[PDB]
C-alpha cells in the first residue's frame with residue numbers, strides 16, 4: 001500500500017508506521033555549518049574487493065543490487081562504527097527532474113539522486129535481526145549529480161530494461177561496487193532510520209561529502225523504470241525519495257575540516 005504518490009506517499013506513512021514521526025528519522029538536511037568536526041572519527045574503511053553481486057531486482061519502489069552476505073566479503077568498518085558491517089544490497093533514490101531526487105540534502109541542496117549501500121552489523125548474525133537493533137545497520141550514502149558519465153554505473157544502467165516492472169529480477173554477477181565511489185571518503189555521520197517503511201531506527205548514516213557524476217543518459221534510464229507490475233498501467237519510477245525529516249535531538253558530525 002505505501003508508495004510515493006499523493007495518496008500513499010511519505011506524508012501518509014505514519015498511519016501504517018507510527019515511527020515515521022519518531023525521534024531519529026531519516027533523511028535529514030545536513031547543515032554543513034552546524035555539523036561538528038570530530039577529530040576522534042576514524043577514516044572510513046571500505047573493503048569491497050571480494051564483493052559478490054548475485055541479482056538485481058525491481059521491488060516496486062526502487063531497484064536493489066543484492067550481494068552474497070553469507071561471508072565477510074564486502075565490509076564497512078572504521079569511520080564512526082564499532083565492529084564490522086556486511087554489504088547486503090545497494091539501491092538509489094532519484095527524481096523526475098535533475099533538480100531533485102536525493103533524500104539527504106546539503107544546506108537545502110537536493111542532488112539528482114542518492115545511492116545507498118546498505119550494510120548490517122555482523123554481531124547480529126543477519127539483516128532481519130540487525131534492523132531490530134539501534135546499531136544494526138550502516139548505510140553509506142553517496143550523492144549523484146548530472147554531468148560526465150560514471151563508467152562503473154553503466155553495467156547497472158544496461159540491465160534495467162530487463163527489470164522494467166515490479167517483481168522482475170535478473171542475474172547480476174561480478175558487479176564491482178568500487179566503481180560507484182567518489183575519490184574522497186570524507187563523510188558526515190548521524191544516527192537515523194531506514195528511509196522507507198518500516199522506517200526502523202537502526203541506521204548509522206555515513207554520507208559522503210563528494211558526489212559522483214552520472215550522465216543525463218544514465219539517469220534518464222533510471223526514469224524509464226516502472227513502479228507498477230507487468231501488464232499494469234504505466235507509472236514511471238521517479239521521485240522515490242523521502243523528504244528531509246526533523247533533526248530533533250541529534251548532532252551531525254563531520255570527519256573533515
Ligand SMILES: CCCCc1cnc(SCC(=O)c2ccc(S(N)(=O)=O)cc2)nc1
Nearest residue numbers: 116118128131139193194195196197198200
Ligand atoms: C518491522 C518488522 C520487520 C523487520 C524487517 C524490516 N525491514 C525489512 S527491510 C527494508 C529494507 O531493506 C531497507 C534497506 C535500506 C533502506 S535505506 N533507503 O534507508 O537505505 C530502506 C529499507 N525486513 C525485515
Ligand SMILES: [Zn+2]
Nearest residue numbers: 091093116195
Ligand atoms: Zn535508500
